[PDB]
Amino acid sequence: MKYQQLENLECGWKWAYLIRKHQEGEPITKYIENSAAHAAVDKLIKLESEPVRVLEWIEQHMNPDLFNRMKQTIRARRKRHFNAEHQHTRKKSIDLDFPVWHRLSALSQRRGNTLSETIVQLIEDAERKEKYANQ
Amino acid sequence: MKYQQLENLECGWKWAYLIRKHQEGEPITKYIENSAAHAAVDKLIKLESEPVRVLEWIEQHMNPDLFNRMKQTIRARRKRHFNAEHQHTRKKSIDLDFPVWHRLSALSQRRGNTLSETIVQLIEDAERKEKYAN
Amino acid sequence: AIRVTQSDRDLFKHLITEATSYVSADYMRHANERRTHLDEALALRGELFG
Amino acid sequence: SSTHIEQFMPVKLAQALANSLFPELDSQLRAGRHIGIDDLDNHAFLMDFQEQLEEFYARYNVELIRAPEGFFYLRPRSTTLIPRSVLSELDMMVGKILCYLYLSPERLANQGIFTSQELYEELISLADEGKLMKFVNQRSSGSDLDKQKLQEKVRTTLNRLRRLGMVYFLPNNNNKFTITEAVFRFGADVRSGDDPREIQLRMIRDGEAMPV
Amino acid sequence: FMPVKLAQALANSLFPELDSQLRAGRHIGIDDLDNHAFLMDFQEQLEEFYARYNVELIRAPEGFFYLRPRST
Amino acid sequence: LAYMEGGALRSMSDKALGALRLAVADNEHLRDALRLSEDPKRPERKVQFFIAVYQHLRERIRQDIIRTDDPVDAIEQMEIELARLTEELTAREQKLAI
DNA sequence: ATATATATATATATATATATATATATATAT
DNA sequence: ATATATATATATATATATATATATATATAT
DNA sequence: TGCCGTTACAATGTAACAGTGG
DNA sequence: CCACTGTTACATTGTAACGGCA
């Protein structure tokens, strides 16, 4: 375990995720009957200020589909929350044109390294050229 | 004008955008009184499936300050919609670690190029170095 | 009157204590790490200058 | 969504207007009756939904106003949708006297229960007997018939103020009464330590008091 | 709570003036097009609203509306 | 708190937030401020929220004698008043019994 | 000095909701 | 093969809330 | 200017892989 | 083995800022 797990924060995250999914129209409940699903959703809504019971609501009415997406989303949210503290640990999102991305990805799988590592090697070669021009 | 604009599509986009914003708590309407805002929002909700009247609804009840954001969101939606048809026109999104991004952007502002142009030039130089050696 | 005053006092006590607990801890945490980062940066600076 | 109260009205205003106390309070208020701390139920109702009722009555171009003493009432505007009226000068004399009795400790033994005779005695003690009588009848010169007429006029004005809520007759006695904090409005021209002629202009500008 | 359509009727901007004129005893005939139409539309609830005041909202055979006070 | 480390501070802050969630559910704008305060990218928000808390309790003062606007100060006056009320209650119940 | 309008209280009748006790049909023990 | 217990339906009547009408006090006005 | 394309981001959600410890 | 965690590489949508163009 590298990231501290906080219960009262991850529980709130989970509740918000469930509410977002439902309001998006998805069937968070495991119930096919409309009435039981509605009752479970209403109770979940009441659980707004009690994130602790959200775990129990999960164990009682959460759709079996969502375990993987849940554990993925909350894991990623935890990682991002802990990384956002410092800039040097932050991430920057950029968009690339298809030809450029195609060439870059081909180069990276050729070198067997991540995109950031490939960019590091490339920019380092350019900066090495600049340095040798300078010395 | 590069992309032709389609009403039954862009109007649905606008309706969905406004509904999303309202669900997010944004004040869609210009009415400070909660009753008029709620009435207008209900009209909008029941206004689904209507371009020619959602446009009028916007003209009549729309919040003044969201016009630009909605306009640019629709611009981006249109451009993405037209570009997502072909592979060469699509765009690939990636995440770069902050130091790497800082250095790459340093190069891009220094040279006046965009990220795509800067990376293309750098890769081309790397390829040229390979060919020099090879 | 007794009920009302008791509720008010309890609410005030709880709110104040919990708000202080919630905020001051993060404040101290940040202060501590800022101190630590400064300490580390000075060593880096000295080594760099040499 | 449709069929939803918030579409038209705030929830609390609708709840207040549907309350059993709303109609009697509204009828009394529109009649001009002041509300004091004694009507615990009505006073509490006003406190709870004070804002809803001020905004509601604003639709009539009349301000629901709570004096600092804590008693609510209505002040119509020039464009009032509900008519407006001004008290008589004799009404002012008697109202000022009642404020004095409310604040007067000498009569503390009365314990708040006062008779019209005592009110008349205090009034004549502090006011100008004959020059005040002049208003009751232009041809008065101290005649005891006109004296009885003035007593009767004071009784009638007292009844009217009772109608306005400034005074309560006792559950069984109409010849004895208890004063209410609303009477403090009769001192609004002197509650502020400033020049009387400026407080008068301020008040008339506020619509609080017209001249004669 | 409150009936929804009753709430709609009360909120209507015509309600203050019409209410004042009714409580003043005025009779609303066919000449007052807006008020008469409003009363036609929302009678089912203004009758209840004014029955809360122990008063009856009566539509005469001629058509004009008015308020009849009860003993209470 | 200077002595402890980041982990304990974070854990107890999480616990305090858990308490707050209950203590704040009633309020809407203050609850919203509490929710906003959780962003790690803007720690100052936390302080802002704290201010609001005071700016809330300040208005909950009842009457003149409790106008020690410092909320922590009013506690002692309130406790004194509770004791006083205890005595008055005793007197009133005795009166009622007789 | 007395006619008249207004507010208040009481009795009286209406109408509705509801609990109680009995009668009837069926079930089940002897 | 019989008699007792259950559930159902019904009228009774009990109480409440409403609305009406009359008497009263009494405050105004001629 | 006012629209319109365009870029460079931000925030969150997912799938997939790699690690880690029991 | 097995589960849970950390990480990367996207996608998806929104936004602000430039710059082109009538």
Residue numbers in the entry:
A (entry chain J): 1 to 135
B (entry chain I): 1 to 134
C (entry chain B): 248 to 297
D (entry chain E): 2 to 213
E (entry chain F): 9 to 80
F (entry chain B): 1138 to 1235
The authors write:
The ring-like structural maintenance of chromosomes (SMC) complex MukBEF folds the genome of Escherichia coli and related bacteria into large loops, presumably by active DNA loop extrusion. MukBEF activity within the replication terminus macrodomain is suppressed by the sequence-specific unloader MatP. MukBEF is the SMC complex of E. coli and other enterobacteria. Its SMC subunit is MukB, which associates with the kleisin MukF (Woo et al., 2009; Zawadzka et al., 2018).
We then reconstituted a complex of MukBEQEF dimers, MatP, and an 80-bp DNA oligonucleotide containing matS close to one end in the presence of ATP and magnesium ions. The MukBEQEF-MatP-matS complex is prevented from hydrolysing ATP and shows a state prior to unloading. Sub-classification of the cryo-EM dataset revealed additional forms of MukBEF-MatP with arms in different states of openness. The most open class has arms unzipped up to the elbow, and the most closed one is the apo state.
